[PDB]
Symmetry: D2
Subunit: 461 residues, 4 copies
């Protein structure tokens, strides 16, 4: 005998799966009772979450709106049409000049789909080196030549780097590499770059070597939407993005592409059908329609005046956080920031990023180690989106800087006393009284702000 539908199908999670329920409660507590500085993280809205956990997960709609395999997509079509039109609006794109595909499962699928669409296998791609602040999906092989990223497995990648002494992109060496290598595709955008991007310069480099130009704006997409950084759409052929991170949406991807007539022969752009086809049927199956509904929510939120003020506040919080760190004598790559993150150079203090990351982590401050100047990594990457989504402003971020300051000095006390090597450093973390104290008034600080996505006046813990 089958279970009644009411028993297996309508019964709440807390009763069907106490184990998993309990873990989500604990994870919910972890998220609002520490300090989140991972620059690729954010806290999304309840409305987004409600669309994401919805009956939309039950519909199969392989194809495009108005062009499906299966019937019954009357309402799914309107959800996706609305999501695509809200995506153009949020980024101030004219529909005769730009299209978007909102079906990629995530950022990396959006990148690989775009590659598939405009490149043949083994075509050459250039992307910002991983050690200089780029992303795995822009190409990565090891010094031994092992192809790590699938972009490097199925295409031929060669990275460009930042200037080793200023930490800025080396646009002259980017051009020299592009002219020797002759990539079919140049990627800009990145994950740990703390400055804006000269898209006009990338566009001149691309024209000079005959390359397509793609911007991956996953990290700054929320800043792009609020027109708080340079718009890649002004100069790029294709723009890919995640929809979480600074956009504050669900986990999903988008591919934007130029439509209509080209600039100066006398022909038009060829991207739309190649990109839709690359996503389906080539690479993906049914779209995740609950993601698309949730993203359409996030994109509406991303157009509001409130979101334009959020992105403004993300920048000023990062500035004030770094202004405060340099105030203590600390070193930031490029000496400041123009976006949502700072990159802290710890090599002047004789420390590695691993050490600061491990100790911060013991106080519920989450950062990640990061290579510096294209170089064990010498820095940490610190981002503002997540804590700004909880309503922290400059003074709160200057206070986060104080916690980081306290964290790094305790990291030095341990290194002075126990040894430079990692195994030695670890000895100073076993029952460290001062680490416990910083964890304490870090947790008390984080308890002072609100939290989107769920009511803290409701959590199990």
């Amino acid at each position: 005998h089958m279970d009644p539908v009411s028993v297996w199908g309508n019964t709440p999670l807390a009763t069907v799966d106490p184990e998993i329920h309990d873990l989500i409660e604990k994870e919910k507590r972890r998220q609002c009772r520490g300090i989140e500085l991972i620059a690729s993280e954010n806290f999304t809205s309840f409305a987004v979450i409600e669309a994401l956990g919805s009956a939309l997960t039950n519909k199969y709609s392989e194809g495009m709106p108005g062009n499906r395999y299966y019937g019954g997509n009357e309402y799914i079509d309107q959800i996706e049409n609305l999501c695509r039109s809200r995506a153009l609006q949020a980024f101030h794109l004219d529909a005769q000049s730009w299209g978007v595909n909102v079906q990629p499962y995530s950022g990396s699928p959006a990148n690989f789909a775009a590659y598939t669409a405009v490149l043949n296998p083994h075509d050459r791609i250039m992307g910002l080196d991983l050690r200089s602040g780029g992303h795995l999906t822009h190409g990565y092989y090891t010094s031994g030549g092992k192809k790590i990223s699938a972009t490097s497995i199925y295409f031929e990648s060669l990275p460009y780097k930042v200037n080793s002494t200023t930490g800025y992109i080396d646009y002259d060496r980017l051009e020299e590499k592009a002219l020797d290598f002759r990539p079919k595709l140049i990627i800009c955008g990145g994950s740990a770059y703390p400055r804006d991007w000269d898209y006009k310069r990338f566009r001149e480099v691309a024209d000079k070597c005959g390359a397509l130009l793609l911007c991956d704006m996953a990290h700054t997409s929320g800043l792009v939407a609020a027109q708080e950084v340079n718009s890649p759409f002004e100069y790029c052929d294709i723009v890919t993005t995640t929809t979480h991170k600074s956009l504050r949406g669900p986990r999903a991807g988008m591919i934007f592409y130029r439509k209509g007539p080209k600039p100066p022969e006398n022909a038009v752009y060829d991207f739309e059908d190649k990109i839709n086809f690359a996503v389906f049927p080539s690479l993906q199956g049914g779209p995740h329609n609950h993601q698309i509904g949730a993203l359409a929510v996030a994109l509406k939120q991303a157009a509001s005046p409130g979101f334009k003020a959020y992105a403004k506040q993300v920048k000023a919080n990062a500035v004030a956080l770094g202004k405060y760190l340099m105030g203590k004598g600390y070193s930031l790559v490029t000496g400041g920031t123009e976006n949502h993150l700072v990159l802290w150079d710890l090599r002047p203090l004789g420390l590695t990023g691993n050490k600061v990351e491990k100790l911060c982590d013991l106080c519920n401050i989450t950062v990640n180690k990061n290579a510096v100047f294209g170089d064990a990594p010498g820095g940490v990457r610190i981002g503002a989106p997540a804590m700004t989504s909880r309503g922290l402003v400059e003074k709160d971020f200057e206070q986060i800087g104080e916690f980081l300051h306290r964290a790094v000095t305790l990291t030095l006390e341990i290194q002075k006393e126990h040894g430079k090597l990692l195994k030695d450093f670890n000895k100073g973390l076993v029952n460290n009284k001062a680490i416990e104290d910083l964890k304490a008034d870090v947790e008390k600080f984080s308890a002072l702000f609100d939290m989107p996505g769920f009511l803290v006046s409701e959590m199990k813990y």
Copy 2:
């Protein structure tokens, strides 16, 4: 000038923040329960699954593996994913020493492409069931004109195997011959529109004969496999990939199962584990979708319950009872029946195309899909049992479903006989048709007589 307070943008429900999208989800909820969903790849998951899926787990970046992550703060994400891995092994009756699983693939297609990337180099030869014979796009597909459609056929070299063109069964002898000429490095079994079980033993013998890896893509029948209601691919395949929705009744996600430990006969062991994981991350994917992994772990504990075993038996019996009902009316099914969750209905002996039947079925809120028949315009429809079984339908309810389909195909012939065979003519019989409208009304009324998982019918906007 002011930032929106957290309560205003962040805690407000979707019904206030986004009334348009709320309205559409509400409308989609009613469509899902006022019609008869017979898409074989469709299901209705549980409210428990949905609650994990829409949760704060979407906020955590956890690239890497449990215990080897890039970022800190994965204390509880690691436990959710480990429990998901161990429940995936338990739900398919696998010893943790012999089998491992990766539960990070975003969907079934990412699961397949990451399995390919793990064990193949670019341009390695793959063999899979022909799309026209019931296979899936991600197993390989190029058109008669040579255009490579599937990514699998773009970055690898694929060559399809087909059903016997007169019986509808997989032609195992022609599979062995193609595999010995072509020498694929990977043979894929499993399919989307195949109505019989799979002879994995025979696939193993072919793979051993030509030196190929053997992978089962069990997406369509994963629920039947977990319930031990169809043949187990784990007994003979090196790798097993799957979706987690469809007959498994979970979220939209994917899993890659892989053998571990000592190989059968020198003294070597299986090398799959590290290559699979590394292929998912860092080669192909970014951060995992931790809300899907939570929803999946929920679905996998549900799939291990005694009711799910009974749901699976019931799915098979509803397909069989629906099929026997159709052949009781003189209809033809490919292979004359079913051994799983779907039946393939050959409409060519009635002079109809699957399009004409699928369109009129749609206008009564009966969702089927047209489908190629016997490896051959598509001349069949595909009909699946999982979705309506999840709503509690049993054999007599699927005989009633066969009744409405019978009425559908009768009205379809009437219209063809009156207006003509061209599609432009056919459409003329679908406007102001009190017989279609009586069937739509009869489908709706029949449909409202059953419960619905995932949400409460007593709470809908419509």
Copy 3:
């Protein structure tokens, strides 16, 4: 001090290099005092040899006639123009409809160049299976999937086979394979196929799957020139060939290609520039101009009435050789021949090709073992060109059959007496009195005919 030019540069080989001189004399003796049945072998003319050993080896002429890199090619241009025009004449080709490139160093470079010209890397090719009578350069991988032929390394090959019971090409299975596999290129021609080729059928198969059709006529090119077999030019897009073998030229290659207007849109053939460019600059360096001069000699000889009678005699000699072998109860694949070779099936006699080949070799009869019916190989391949070039006619070839008959029966005496296994069989070759006798009146038989290329009334031995 340098050597005078007269000492190092004009002094004959016999004085500069007695070792190498002596080996060429011995090799010259070997060639006229045994029986040459390797179907890919011939004996070329003295005139050809004189052009081949000439100052033409000293000129660098990368490029095409009238389109060279280096100057000083006034006379080299006329040699190559004349060779290309003599190549079209010898094969009865209209110059507005066919072009030829005579620069490939050999047959295999001519095949790989042609592939390079019309295919992209990893494009699919179908060729006659090696075990069914095809050539390495048409594609070969092992049962373990190791890519042996470069055609299979750099392209994707799939072979078609002969019918396992008639030994004829299976044209129905060729079409079924081509429709599943969808090759960009289908190759016909072969090395051990004893029948003619249905080029009209290959052309219908190629049109049905959208493939280019290339014939590799290396083995039968002399028969094609004398219009004694079916002309591939009638139905093929590209024809490649060696220029030795039955053409009786130097060792070199040629690529023939369709020019002018296509058959039924309204466009023209695209092969000429792609093929010239593939040979140079893509694949080869300077052409071997002494080969081209020698080939131009061979092609003139190939147009003469004498050569048309040679090719007629090559066929009738093979027919009479096989007619005689079947007269003794022996089995030939397809039961006869239409070209220059027969394929002897030795499995009815319980023997392998290795055994007959080794024993024949001990009597200065040269044959090679060969797989039969696409299957240790069960047959030997026996060809008529070489011995026909020495003026042997039917009765002489029937006498060669008698020698083969004597050879196989002695091979059976040894197998009956010593054992089926190879190591056992070898025991019966150590100081075998009867093998010595057959070697004796094989050597006396071969001494009875003339020899082109050098005067036997002049050899050291």
Copy 4:
């Protein structure tokens, strides 16, 4: 109706069988010895080499290796090829335990492509000296527009390294940087128009730093290498390929040298031997050209003689003496001199293109070729010494060659100054020019004053 008797078609000399071709070879023989051949890749081989080349060795099929052939009857072909292999090792002072050679490549380009195929998979990265900087097509070449020209760039992934744009020397620091970004699997050294020796030690250090194999293509300077007159690539390279004509003075053929035995620092040995041989046959070539292998074995014994060592010293000195003569007139050479067999003459400081100088030189039967300068219409000419040294010319004769070139470039400027810089104008100064004709006459008269190898001047038709 009758077969031509063997004597008639087979033994008759070329002068009777084919008078046209005989006439053309006779005419080509006179062109070769009435002019001044300065193509750096050109030489005049010996009558002994030619006699082996045009011989009954062309009649033998011998696919495979000595002692492992497909066909029988290779008793003496095996001995010729073994003696060729052992003489190739002896002529380059290689221990048979440390080095092996394959002498079946049909030419230099087949030698290179077979070496690539042996040690690389398709699409592996290769680095070679840029064509514009003096490299060879077979080391990699694609145009600014992306079109892949070289087969090496079609089936592999190439990226060039260049000369320093102001000194003309290989930029070893920029080589190391490119090689660490690109990570080629193979670095190629050697070139066609490079006027200095190679720092193989430094190439080895770069190869070890990035994990690449190191191959020298020594085609241009193989004669100087055998004579130990330039740096030995064998001391630092894994593989060495070469033509056998050019400065080695042999037939047109190729060789692939490869290291054997124990590797320097674990405990492994070199794996090159079998892969190289297998790449030549069966992967890439058919039957070897046994007449070339015989001619080559002749050339290699000649290359081991004391006169060849003196010929090689003399080639270097004639290039140096020609270069010093040109700079004595104010001309410019890339890098200011030569360390080998050629000089690169930069004509841009005279406002001339290499074309204009090469055309007027040609009209006096002085064969040079125009050539790119400093990695940059081509602005130099390339001038080689091997061919004219083989005719016995010494330093004073090459100073006389520099005199005629000086006259050539003076007449070239006069014509540019009178008629103009456009090529259409330039040609106007080449018709009825008693000064060109006096130089052509002076070249011919100077040219006839020296012997000629390969054939007897006392026997020519002209």
